[PDB]
Amino acid sequence: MIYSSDLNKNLASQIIEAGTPIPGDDVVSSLKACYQCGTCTGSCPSGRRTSYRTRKVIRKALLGMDDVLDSDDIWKCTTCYTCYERCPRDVKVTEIIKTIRNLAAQKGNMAKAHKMTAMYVLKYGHAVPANKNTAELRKSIGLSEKAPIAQFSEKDLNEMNTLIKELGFDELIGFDWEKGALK
Amino acid sequence: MKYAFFLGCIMPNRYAGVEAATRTVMEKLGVELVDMTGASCCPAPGVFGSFDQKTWLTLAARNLCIAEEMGVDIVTVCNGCYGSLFEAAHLLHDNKEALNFVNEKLDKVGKEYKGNVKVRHFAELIYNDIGVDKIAEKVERPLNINVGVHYGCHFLKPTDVKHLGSAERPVMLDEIVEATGAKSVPYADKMMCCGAGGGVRARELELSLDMTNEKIENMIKAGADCTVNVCPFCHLQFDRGQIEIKEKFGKEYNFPVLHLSQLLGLAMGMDPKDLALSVHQISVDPLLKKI
Amino acid sequence: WEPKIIGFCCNWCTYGGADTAGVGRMQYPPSIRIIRVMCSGRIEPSLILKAFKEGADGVFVGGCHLGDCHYDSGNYKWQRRVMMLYELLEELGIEKERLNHEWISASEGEKFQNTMKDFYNKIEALGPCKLKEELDK
Amino acid sequence: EPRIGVYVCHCGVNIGGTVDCPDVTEFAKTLKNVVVARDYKYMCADPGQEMIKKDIKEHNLNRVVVAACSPRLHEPTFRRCVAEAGLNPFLFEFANIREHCSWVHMHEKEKATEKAKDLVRMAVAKARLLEPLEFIKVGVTQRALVIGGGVAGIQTALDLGDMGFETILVEKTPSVGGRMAQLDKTFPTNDCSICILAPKMVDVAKHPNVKLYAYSEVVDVQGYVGNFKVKIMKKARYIDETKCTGCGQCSEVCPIDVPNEFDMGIGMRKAIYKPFPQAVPAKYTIDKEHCIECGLCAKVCGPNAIDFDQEPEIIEAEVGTIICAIGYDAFDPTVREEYGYGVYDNVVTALELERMINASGPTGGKVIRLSDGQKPKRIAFIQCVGSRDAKVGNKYCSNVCCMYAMKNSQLIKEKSPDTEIDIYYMDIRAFSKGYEEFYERSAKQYGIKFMRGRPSQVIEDPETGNLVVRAEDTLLGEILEKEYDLVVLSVGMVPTKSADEVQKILGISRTPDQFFMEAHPKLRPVDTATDGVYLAGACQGPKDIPASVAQGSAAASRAAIPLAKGEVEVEPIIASVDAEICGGCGVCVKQCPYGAPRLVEKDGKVVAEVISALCKGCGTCPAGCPSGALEQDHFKTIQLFKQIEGMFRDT
Amino acid sequence: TFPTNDCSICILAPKMVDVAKHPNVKLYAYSEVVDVQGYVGNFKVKIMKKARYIDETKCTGCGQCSEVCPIDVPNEFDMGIGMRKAIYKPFPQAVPAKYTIDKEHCIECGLCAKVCGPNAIDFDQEPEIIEAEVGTIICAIGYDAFDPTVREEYGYGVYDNVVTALELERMINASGPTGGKVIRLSDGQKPKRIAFIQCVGSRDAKVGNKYCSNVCCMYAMKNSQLIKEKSPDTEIDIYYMDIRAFSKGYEEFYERSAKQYGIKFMRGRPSQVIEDPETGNLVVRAEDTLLGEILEKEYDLVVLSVGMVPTKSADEVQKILGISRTPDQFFMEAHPKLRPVDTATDGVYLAGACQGPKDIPASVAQGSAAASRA
Amino acid sequence: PNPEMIAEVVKALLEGKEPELPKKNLCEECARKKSEEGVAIETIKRNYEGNPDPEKCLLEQGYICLGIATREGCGAPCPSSGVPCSGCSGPTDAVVDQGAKMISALCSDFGIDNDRDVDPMILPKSIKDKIGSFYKFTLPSAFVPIRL
Numbered sequence A: 001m002i003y004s005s006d007l008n009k010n011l012a013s014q015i016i017e018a019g020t021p022i023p024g025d026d027v028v029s030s031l032k033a034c035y036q037c038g039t040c041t042g043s044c045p046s047g048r049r050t051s052y053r054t055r056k057v058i059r060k061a062l063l064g065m066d067d068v069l070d071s072d073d074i075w076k077c078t079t080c081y082t083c084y085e086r087c088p089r090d091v092k093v094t095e096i097i098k099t100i101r102n103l104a105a106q107k108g109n110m111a112k113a114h115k116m117t118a119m120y121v122l123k124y125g126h127a128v129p130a131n132k133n134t135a136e137l138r139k140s141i142g143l144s145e146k147a148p149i150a151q152f153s154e155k156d157l158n159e160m161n162t163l164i165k166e167l168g169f170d171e172l173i174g175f176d177w178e179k180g181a182l183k
Numbered sequence B: 001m002k003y004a005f006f007l008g009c010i011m012p013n014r015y016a017g018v019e020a021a022t023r024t025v026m027e028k029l030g031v032e033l034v035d036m037t038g039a040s041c042c043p044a045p046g047v048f049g050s051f052d053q054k055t056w057l058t059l060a061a062r063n064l065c066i067a068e069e070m071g072v073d074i075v076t077v078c079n080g081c082y083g084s085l086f087e088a089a090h091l092l093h094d095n096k097e098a099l100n101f102v103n104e105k106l107d108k109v110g111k112e113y114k115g116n117v118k119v120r121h122f123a124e125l126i127y128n129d130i131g132v133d134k135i136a137e138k139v140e141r142p143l144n145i146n147v148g149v150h151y152g153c154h155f156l157k158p159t160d161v162k163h164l165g166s167a168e169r170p171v172m173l174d175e176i177v178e179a180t181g182a183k184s185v186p187y188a189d190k191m192m193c194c195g196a197g198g199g200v201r202a203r204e205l206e207l208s209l210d211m212t213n214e215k216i217e218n219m220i221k222a223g224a225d226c227t228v229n230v231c232p233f234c235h236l237q238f239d240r241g242q243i244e245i246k247e248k249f250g251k252e253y254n255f256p257v258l259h260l261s262q263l264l265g266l267a268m269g270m271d272p273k274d275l276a277l278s279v280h281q282i283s284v285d286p287l288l289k290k291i
Numbered sequence C: 001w002e003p004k005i006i007g008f009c010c011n012w013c014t015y016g017g018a019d020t021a022g023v024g025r026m027q028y029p030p031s032i033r034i035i036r037v038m039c040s041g042r043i044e045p046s047l048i049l050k051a052f053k054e055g056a057d058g059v060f061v062g063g064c065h066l067g068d069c070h071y072d073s074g075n076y077k078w079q080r081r082v083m084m085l086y087e088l089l090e091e092l093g094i095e096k097e098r099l100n101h102e103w104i105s106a107s108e109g110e111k112f113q114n115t116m117k118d119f120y121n122k123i124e125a126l127g128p129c130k131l132k133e134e135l136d137k
Numbered sequence D: 001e002p003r004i005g006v007y008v009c010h011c012g013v014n015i016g017g018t019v020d021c022p023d024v025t026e027f028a029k030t031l032k033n034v035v036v037a038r039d040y041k042y043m044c045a046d047p048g049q050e051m052i053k054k055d056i057k058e059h060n061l062n063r064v065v066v067a068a069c070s071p072r073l074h075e076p077t078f079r080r081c082v083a084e085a086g087l088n089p090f091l092f093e094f095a096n097i098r099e100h101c102s103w104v105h106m107h108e109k110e111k112a113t114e115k116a117k118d119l120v121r122m123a124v125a126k127a128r129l130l131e132p133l134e135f136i137k138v139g140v141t142q143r144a145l146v147i148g149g150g151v152a153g154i155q156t157a158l159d160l161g162d163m164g165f166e167t168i169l170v171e172k173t174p175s176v177g178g179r180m181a182q183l184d185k186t187f188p189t190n191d192c193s194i195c196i197l198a199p200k201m202v203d204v205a206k207h208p209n210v211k212l213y214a215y216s217e218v219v220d221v222q223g224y225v226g227n228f229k230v231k232i233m234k235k236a237r238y239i240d241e242t243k244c245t246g247c248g249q250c251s252e253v254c255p256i257d258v259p260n261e262f263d264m265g266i267g268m269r270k271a272i273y274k275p276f277p278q279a280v281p282a283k284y285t286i287d288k289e290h291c292i293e294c295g296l297c298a299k300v301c302g303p304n305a306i307d308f309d310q311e312p313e314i315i316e317a318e319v320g321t322i323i324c325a326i327g328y329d330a331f332d333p334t335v336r337e338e339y340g341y342g343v344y345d346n347v348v349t350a351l352e353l354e355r356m357i358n359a360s361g362p363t364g365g366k367v368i369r370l371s372d373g374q375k376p377k378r379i380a381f382i383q384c385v386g387s388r389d390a391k392v393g394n395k396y397c398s399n400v401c402c403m404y405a406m407k408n409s410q411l412i413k414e415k416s417p418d419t420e421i422d423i424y425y426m427d428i429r430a431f432s433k434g435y436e437e438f439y440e441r442s443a444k445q446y447g448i449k450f451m452r453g454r455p456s457q458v459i460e461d462p463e464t465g466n467l468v469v470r471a472e473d474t475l476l477g478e479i480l481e482k483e484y485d486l487v488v489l490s491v492g493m494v495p496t497k498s499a500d501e502v503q504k505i506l507g508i509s510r511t512p513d514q515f516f517m518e519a520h521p522k523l524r525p526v527d528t529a530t531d532g533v534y535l536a537g538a539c540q541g542p543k544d545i546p547a548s549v550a551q552g553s554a555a556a557s558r559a560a561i562p563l564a565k566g567e568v569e570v571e572p573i574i575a576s577v578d579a580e581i582c583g584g585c586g587v588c589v590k591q592c593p594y595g596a597p598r599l600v601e602k603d604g605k606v607v608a609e610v611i612s613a614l615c616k617g618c619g620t621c622p623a624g625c626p627s628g629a630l631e632q633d634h635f636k637t638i639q640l641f642k643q644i645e646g647m648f649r650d651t
Numbered sequence E: 001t002f003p004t005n006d007c008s009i010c011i012l013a014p015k016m017v018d019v020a021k022h023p024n025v026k027l028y029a030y031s032e033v034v035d036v037q038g039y040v041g042n043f044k045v046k047i048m049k050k051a052r053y054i055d056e057t058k059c060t061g062c063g064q065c066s067e068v069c070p071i072d073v074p075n076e077f078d079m080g081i082g083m084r085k086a087i088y089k090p091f092p093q094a095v096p097a098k099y100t101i102d103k104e105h106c107i108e109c110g111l112c113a114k115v116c117g118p119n120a121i122d123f124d125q126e127p128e129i130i131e132a133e134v135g136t137i138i139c140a141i142g143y144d145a146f147d148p149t150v151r152e153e154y155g156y157g158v159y160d161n162v163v164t165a166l167e168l169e170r171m172i173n174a175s176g177p178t179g180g181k182v183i184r185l186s187d188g189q190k191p192k193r194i195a196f197i198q199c200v201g202s203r204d205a206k207v208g209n210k211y212c213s214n215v216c217c218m219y220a221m222k223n224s225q226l227i228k229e230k231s232p233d234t235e236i237d238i239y240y241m242d243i244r245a246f247s248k249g250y251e252e253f254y255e256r257s258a259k260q261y262g263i264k265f266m267r268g269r270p271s272q273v274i275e276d277p278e279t280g281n282l283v284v285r286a287e288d289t290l291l292g293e294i295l296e297k298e299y300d301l302v303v304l305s306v307g308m309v310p311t312k313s314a315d316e317v318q319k320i321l322g323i324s325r326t327p328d329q330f331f332m333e334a335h336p337k338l339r340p341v342d343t344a345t346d347g348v349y350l351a352g353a354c355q356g357p358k359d360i361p362a363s364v365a366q367g368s369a370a371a372s373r374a
Numbered sequence F: 001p002n003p004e005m006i007a008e009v010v011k012a013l014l015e016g017k018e019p020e021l022p023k024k025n026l027c028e029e030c031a032r033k034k035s036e037e038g039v040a041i042e043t044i045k046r047n048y049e050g051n052p053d054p055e056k057c058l059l060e061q062g063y064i065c066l067g068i069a070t071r072e073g074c075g076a077p078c079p080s081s082g083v084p085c086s087g088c089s090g091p092t093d094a095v096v097d098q099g100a101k102m103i104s105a106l107c108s109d110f111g112i113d114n115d116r117d118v119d120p121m122i123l124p125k126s127i128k129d130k131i132g133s134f135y136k137f138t139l140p141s142a143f144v145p146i147r148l
């Protein structure tokens, strides 16, 4: 039983506004053109091994089911862009899902491993930072012990911290600058 | 041909051999890979694009500026980084509202994007600019083995912004690997995802491994001796994932995993010690016995 | 400030494309004011130059696609005229960009819509054309 | 001095809702020469039209300006209105404030109003310099030309013929009947297609008032309504039609095997052939591209019909009206790669299936797999292939695909009740009389299954040749992966290959769907903006047979009007040379594609002179003329100059 | 009128204006064919010119008489939403632009007789019978809307805010009794949430109509676009089974309705409508088949997209002309594929919705087609 | 103005009559032979490029001759002497801007015998100085009479 009181009439608009200006109004507003044909669900490789149905995400969005933001289903999309490529209504499906995830993240629906990966780029400027074995491995091959990346360049590392703070990404992931850990 | 080489994360810090393979392979093809100093994470669209699109583009633009200040275009050996930097480039050039917001942020660090950088994938660069004929000319050790080609998803898709031909039936990598003497065996669902993408490997591991298990099964049934990819993320999924599948699902394939540059390295008479095949989670020795 | 753009459209194609966008409710900026003509072959440098004297910040000319002129070849004559005109404007200190000519069919309302958005923006960026002011001096 | 009347329309809320009409009407009064200005909800309506007529008399107006919809729609309407009031139709001017303003600036009302005001001023500015012109009364040649020998065209030709008008029917291929002839049965009656079309094809071939040119093409058309001079090319069959009997002995001995176009490639025909057994004219044709000239066919030909030294004759004809009925083609699905058309052997288009199901087909009515010739036990129908799809540029519904899929599923069931037929769809569109009932019957009586889901792709088993269909059962919220022996793509309708040639020859436009554009969807559905040229059938848009037939009759009615009157009014917006200003530079002469301006001697000096019959009023030579002697009535340079001024200031 | 969204008057009014002053067309408005005799080419018809009680030649069509008249009669044209007077004109753009008196409601007080300038009012007017000889007859008596009172679960007739789409048309029309304002009949308020119910009286065996009315899908989306243009904030949901946008530009309109105007579509045939007797709002019970879950949404207005049924007088015309009916009760054409506007009865032709449920483009083509044939 | 024309105008005013100027364009007085089929231009040549034919029309030979956009009266001495008219007399009563019209004409006939396939970029690239080729004596009277 789904009553009006359970639905959010602005959910669709909220997704569009979250998608403006990145990736853009015209891109995200494409969800409004979906005619629930199911080409996205049949194309989905994740749907072949889970309860995830790409078409229902768009449906829930258009109907106003906020629970979609709390669903684990949206995080099962690998972003292979196969649905995006085949949709006959030009729905920027993959892009819409990412934007939906942006709203989910703002609601506090983020995995720890994900927040950890985000923290390593904030702290060491990289998703997979170099370890003690990296230095030995790079040397043994015939490459610079330390690669010319932002990890070993404070200037670049600080530039990211400035941008992050301004963007509010630190607040989003719930990062405490003094402790250097998440909340 | 002069291009700023974007390393990324997985290749330089984990599978370093892929870098050493690329550097020497691109050097033999006549491409100057200039150092793109201070380059950070693309960032990974899987996590950042899903966490904050603004943060993904702002950071991606920052890395684009590095090559702009140098006055050169970017080249990479990763689909993830290619997709991220390519999409960032397209969007900043097309959408002015995104370019304004990004530059307003970049002003705080003394940077400004002008829309002059072009992002290229080393595979399409090799196919369109250099030519497949040049690959064959440098084959010192002709590799005669069957290969399970893995195009990935972020290389050709989205096709509307990439413009690298069809994504359903591509022949870009097939012609490149066959120039070394190998055979691109066609397997079921050749264009399906490895499962790692979109942050799935981290948040939903079991799910990603299920997708990889299928790909491996299809490749071995097609008669493949190894799997060649153009993405360190795919590489990790196909290599490290086999260990996870054996420890979890129970299936053991001992299927060798290689990157296109690493494969091209062996073809151009490179030393297997310099290709860092020992650090691989799955032994590459079985394949070395066939070549 | 809002640009003052003038358009000259052929009845059989661009005028019809401008109508199709109206029927389709294809929204676009309110700067342009279209003048109907039977053929783009009617357009000539005097009309475009006259419009700039009058105060046009931008001038748009729409005709049939090359090979589809309802009058067979009027667009080829216009095409030859507009190329000289672009350079004449440069010599007169008027930016090439202030003048824009496109081939839009009676069904191409979506193109017309976009052409209008893109043209307004170009003119908006360039700012007002300061000819009329300099002559009234 | 000009006494202009300005009338701002609201078109209900279409204009009023965005453009503050009362305010434009107040502004209109401030402009020079405007002695009256009103605003009415519907100007084209009775009270609107009488308002203008009453005011022209009561205020002695010599000009009128209507600020409303596009003139491409109601220019004639108002011209007729003001003509009845005594005012010349060319002293009337139209301001486009709806499509060109209100309908495109809905969220910018203040600017929309200001823009409407400019357009009224602009129009008013031109109107001041307008001159009274006399409509050219031209005779109508009592003859009609129909292009395309399909069900649509045969209908038009037969109705005009029955009405007593000489008519010419031109058909590209060697036989009339068109696509219909390729169908086996026709929904919703499941009537044998050919069986009901044949008598019409037979009637039109022996009609006293209809001249038929089969295996012929209209290569050049010149003129205007009532005075069209057409040139038809009677293609060389390389066989004497008067001597041929259509026995078909020649084909049994021909060694060359050419793929049958009628059979969509599924069948093989000979160099010498007949499209289908019920073909009209019942004559044969030799395809010179593949004929080796061995002379084996001549040996078995009794009446000496063959002639390899044949010249394709050109016939000149004068007609009054032309009706276009070229029809349509099927969508090539090779682009939708996931479906595998062109790669997988057992993935066929529905038009191919029609030819397979047809008794007179290359398989003798047998639905067989092209991989092994076996009968498929499980068949999948995929809907909307090449339709309702932006990725292939076709954002339209092909109208019949739903209905023909179910129809062909019923036929497979009649022939083989045990067959499993699944139809993958989005919306079953059975909108006409008996269609829904046909849909109900398909599921209830024939046991045809329907899956609501647009397939994501098709994957062939390279071992058996069978096809797996991947899709989502949206009514279950689960993903299906069913196996089939044959996959039928319900390909949509796209314009025929030659449409681009015809469009250029006739000079007609195309709609966003690429089909031919009607004058107005509801005001004039078979007419075109180009007077004298009409449309009929699928070339106008994707439709079924009943609809095409109605259009053929409708078009004949419309085309019968000028022919019945015998006289029509043509616009006098033509070019003329001022003999006092022209010095005979010769610039104008070659600009005209119709050769209207010619140099002549007058009063001892050389001067250009336009031949009024040859000018179609384009406006290229007056524009090209450097002496200003050449001017186009109603589009004179001074009138356009005043119009440019009108945007910026009053004059 | 879809798909162009032109005004109906735009296309209609000029054709009305033209036919009223055509030299070859004699028009008998407010009249009926009472008897037809003969055969093809030799038909002897009798037309009854009804008494308007107003001289046609003398009437100017000003309408001063209407404001002075005391009796207020419901307007048939407005479908019972608006009221008219004993002396009247169906709509402002009506043709002929003349007035008519209804003696069943007129009390014959004689008040409007003093305000009538030209002495048009003639109470002793006899309805004249005109004899005429014709060769061919074309039937275009059109259609009527389905009375949904039978589908009890929807509550038409019981609930105040459950209207037919034809009533909505009169409500939305600028020249309507509400002045283009979509309002609730319970309190006159503007509905913030509207629900459109499709296939009402169509594709339904329980009401004997196993056919598609053809235009229901299209007009629902159309009127939803109009409500949005007038009031963008409004929530409009369309409960459907199959969106049937099949002709030229139709699907594009469907795409545009969702993409541009934000009209929502629920694939599910509603089970019933239940009014809240407290607020007057209506709850729509249905299943979202694309989700496999049951919905119970609240609305301020419920629009029934009523189908097409033959007009009341069709039985009289059937007998007079001697023509047959199809299973859907509309007039039967000669052949469903080759003679679509002809009848088995030579000389008698059909045109428009009386032949079957269709749109204006189709009805206009049939009119031309029938004229060709006739 | 030629002497005789100056006398005619003054003479008319002295008599009380209204002076009337010639209305035709220069080609009329011009003695150069015109093609009956009309004018057709293949390539635009500069006044130094080549040795012109003394009989054929200079415009048809590829030289920018303003006689076509210039009022008659002078007797066309320039083409009679072997050089194109530079439009010293200005336009006719029906032409406001001489240069604009001269261009319109020049573009229209350029490559007319190959009208559909002639390159439209040949003409602007050929003429390096457009203003000085068409507005030699009338720039101030033009719609755009200055360079901004």
Ligand SMILES: Cc1cc2nc3c(=O)[nH]c(=O)nc-3n(C[C@H](O)[C@H](O)[C@H](O)COP(=O)(O)OP(=O)(O)OC[C@H]3O[C@@H](n4cnc5c(N)ncnc54)[C@H](O)[C@@H]3O)c2cc1C
Pocket (backbone or CB within 6 Å): D147, D148, D149, D150, D151, D152, D153, D170, D171, D172, D173, D175, D176, D177, D178, D179, D180, D183, D185, D186, D187, D188, D216, D217, D218, D325, D326, D327, D328, D329, D330, D350, D351, D354, D400, D404, D407, D492, D496, D498, D502, D536, D537, D538, D539, D543, D544, D545, D546, D548
């Ligand atoms: C697979 C399939 C199944 C269908 N099934 C049905 C059905 O069951 N029932 C139904 O009602 N409808 C059906 N249709 C639709 C039906 O085919 C059309 O409604 C019908 O063909 C329209 O008639 P037409 O004459 O206008 O077009 P066409 O049949 O295509 O005929 C046009 C004619 O013009 C000729 N022509 C083409 N170019 C030129 C030229 N340049 N000059 C001169 N002549 C030219 C052609 O050769 C052809 O003879 C089906 C369509 C398809 C694709």
Ligand SMILES: Cc1cc2nc3c(=O)[nH]c(=O)nc-3n(C[C@H](O)[C@H](O)[C@H](O)COP(=O)(O)OP(=O)(O)OC[C@H]3O[C@@H](n4cnc5c(N)ncnc54)[C@H](O)[C@@H]3O)c2cc1C
Pocket (backbone or CB within 6 Å): E001, E002, E003, E031, E032, E033, E140, E141, E142, E143, E144, E145, E165, E166, E169, E215, E218, E219, E222, E311, E313, E317, E351, E352, E353, E354, E358, E359, E360, E361, E363
């Ligand atoms: C709510 C609604 C919305 C619609 N929207 C659209 C749309 O947006 N676009 C579109 O194209 N179509 C639309 N339609 C369809 C449209 O109404 C019909 O296509 C069209 O009105 C049919 O015209 P007709 O002449 O065939 O029938 P009608 O319009 O009904 O005309 C029948 C005429 O015959 C007269 N008549 C009846 N009986 C007799 C008799 N015994 N003697 C003399 N005269 C008689 C009647 O008074 C009437 O004037 C809509 C329909 C409805 C109900």
Ligand code: SF4
Pocket (backbone or CB within 6 Å): A033, A034, A035, A036, A037, A038, A039, A040, A041, A054, A055, A058, A083, A086, A087, A088, A089, A090, A091, A093, D454
């Ligand atoms: S494909 Fe595009 S349209 Fe069909 S469902 Fe997935 S989203 Fe809506």
Ligand code: SF4
Pocket (backbone or CB within 6 Å): A040, A043, A044, A045, A046, A047, A054, A076, A077, A078, A079, A080, A081, A082, A083, A084, A093, A094, A097
């Ligand atoms: S993208 Fe996300 S959704 Fe679209 S297919 Fe790949 S996974 Fe399924």
Ligand code: SF4
Pocket (backbone or CB within 6 Å): D239, D243, D244, D245, D246, D247, D248, D249, D250, D251, D283, D284, D300, D301, D302, D303, D305, D306
């Ligand atoms: S050609 Fe000679 S043989 Fe072939 S059919 Fe006509 S007659 Fe029989």
Ligand code: SF4
Pocket (backbone or CB within 6 Å): D253, D254, D255, D256, D270, D271, D272, D286, D290, D291, D292, D293, D294, D295, D296, D297, D298
């Ligand atoms: S000639 Fe020889 S080849 Fe050409 S057709 Fe008659 S038989 Fe077949």
Ligand code: SF4
Pocket (backbone or CB within 6 Å): D383, D384, D385, D387, D388, D396, D397, D398, D399, D400, D401, D402, D403, D427, D428, D429, D490, D492, E246
């Ligand atoms: S008709 Fe049925 S199938 Fe053919 S397009 Fe419209 S919907 Fe898709």
Ligand code: SF4
Pocket (backbone or CB within 6 Å): D577, D581, D582, D583, D584, D585, D586, D587, D588, D589, D597, D607, D608, D624, D625, D626, D627, D628, D629, D630, F025
């Ligand atoms: S072009 Fe103008 S001038 Fe040269 S001739 Fe033709 S008309 Fe007389």
Ligand code: SF4
Pocket (backbone or CB within 6 Å): C071, D574, D575, D591, D592, D593, D594, D595, D596, D597, D610, D614, D615, D616, D617, D618, D619, D620, D621, D622
């Ligand atoms: S106007 Fe167009 S048509 Fe009339 S003459 Fe000059 S060029 Fe030939």
Ligand code: SF4
Pocket (backbone or CB within 6 Å): D009, D010, D011, D012, D041, D042, D043, D044, D045, D068, D069, D070, D074, D098, E007, E009, E010, E011
């Ligand atoms: S048609 Fe032109 S005039 Fe008749 S109403 Fe609609 S807008 Fe006003």
Ligand code: SF4
Pocket (backbone or CB within 6 Å): E054, E058, E059, E060, E061, E062, E063, E064, E065, E066, E098, E099, E115, E116, E117, E118, E119, E120, E121
């Ligand atoms: S008043 Fe007399 S005239 Fe004026 S309308 Fe009512 S009736 Fe016709």
Ligand code: SF4
Pocket (backbone or CB within 6 Å): E068, E069, E070, E071, E085, E086, E087, E101, E106, E107, E108, E109, E110, E111, E112, E113
């Ligand atoms: S008399 Fe009959 S009509 Fe005249 S007013 Fe009293 S009621 Fe209305």
Ligand code: SF4
Pocket (backbone or CB within 6 Å): D431, E198, E199, E200, E202, E203, E211, E212, E213, E214, E215, E216, E217, E218, E242, E243, E244, E305, E307
């Ligand atoms: S049209 Fe759409 S709504 Fe009306 S009946 Fe046919 S299906 Fe039901």
Ligand code: SF4
Pocket (backbone or CB within 6 Å): D585, F026, F027, F030, F031, F032, F056, F057, F058, F059, F060, F065, F066, F067, F068, F076, F079, F084, F085
């Ligand atoms: S030369 Fe110049 S002037 Fe003499 S005729 Fe040829 S063009 Fe006219």
Ligand code: SF4
Pocket (backbone or CB within 6 Å): F066, F067, F070, F074, F075, F076, F077, F078, F079, F084, F085, F086, F087, F088, F089
């Ligand atoms: S230049 Fe002055 S003089 Fe020489 S021709 Fe042209 S006009 Fe006559």
Ligand SMILES: O=S(=O)(O)CCS
Pocket (backbone or CB within 6 Å): A079, B044, B045, B046, B047, B079, B080, B081, B154, B196, B197, B198, B199, B200, B231, B233
């Ligand atoms: O999308 S992810 O950045 O997580 C993987 C790279 S293809």
